[PDB]
């Protein structure tokens, strides 16, 4: 079947492993478990297309920019993930998406900026910000919450049909 290699990207505790594994098991993941790298890969129906997603859950510290380069040119689609309650995560987010066009020869990416943890009040990256970052790529801008579930299944979907228009 036709498979998707998605990667999930953005700095350290912005929810890349809440998202993920609400996406894929159908829970929020409340405690403190750093990822250096998971994979997890599940046959789903996406648009009547049998396919599998093959998703790569990465880790947001530093200490391991070696792998990236490894699996940013393996990744057909990012998701970009900063918080909407940490603004130096999303200050960060122009970072990936440059080592990402680099690595790839590609200005034109299938990728998604995602705003996550949209349930909580204190917000402090302004949603519109983050719009007109987004725009200036070309690409869309989602605001999920891995709590909630609100645009779990929209962000990763999307990306899907970025790679299936690219
Ligand atoms: N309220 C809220 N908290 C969230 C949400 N997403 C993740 N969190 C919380 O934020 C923390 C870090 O989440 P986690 O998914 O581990 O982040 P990560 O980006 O995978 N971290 P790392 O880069 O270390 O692997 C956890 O306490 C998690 O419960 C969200 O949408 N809402
Ligand atoms: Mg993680």
Redo the contacts with the bound molecule.
């Keep these: 079947m036709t498979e998707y290699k998605l990667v999930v990207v ?10 993920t594994i609400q996406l894929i098991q159908n829970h ?8 250096i790298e998971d994979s997890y890969r599940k046959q789903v129906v996406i648009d009547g297309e049998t396919c599998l997603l093959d998703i790569l ?1 990465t ?3 530093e200490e391991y920019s070696a792998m990236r380069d490894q699996y940013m040119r393996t990744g057909e689609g990012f998701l970009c ?1 900063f918080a909407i309650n940490n603004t130096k995560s999303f200050e960060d987010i122009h970072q990936y998406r440059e080592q990402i066009k680099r690595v790839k020869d590609s200005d034109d990416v299938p990728m998604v900026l995602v705003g ?5 009040a204190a917000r402090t990256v302004e949603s519109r910000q983050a719009q007109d970052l987004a725009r200036s790529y070309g690409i869309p801008y989602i605001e ?4 909630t579930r609100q645009g779990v299944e929209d962000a990763f979907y999307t990306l899907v049909r970025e790679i299936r228009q690219h």
């Design positions: 953005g700095a350290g505790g912005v929810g890349k492993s809440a998202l929020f993941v409340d405690e403190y478990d750093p990822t859950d880790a947001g510290q993930v996550n943890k949209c349930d909580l999920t919450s891995a709590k």
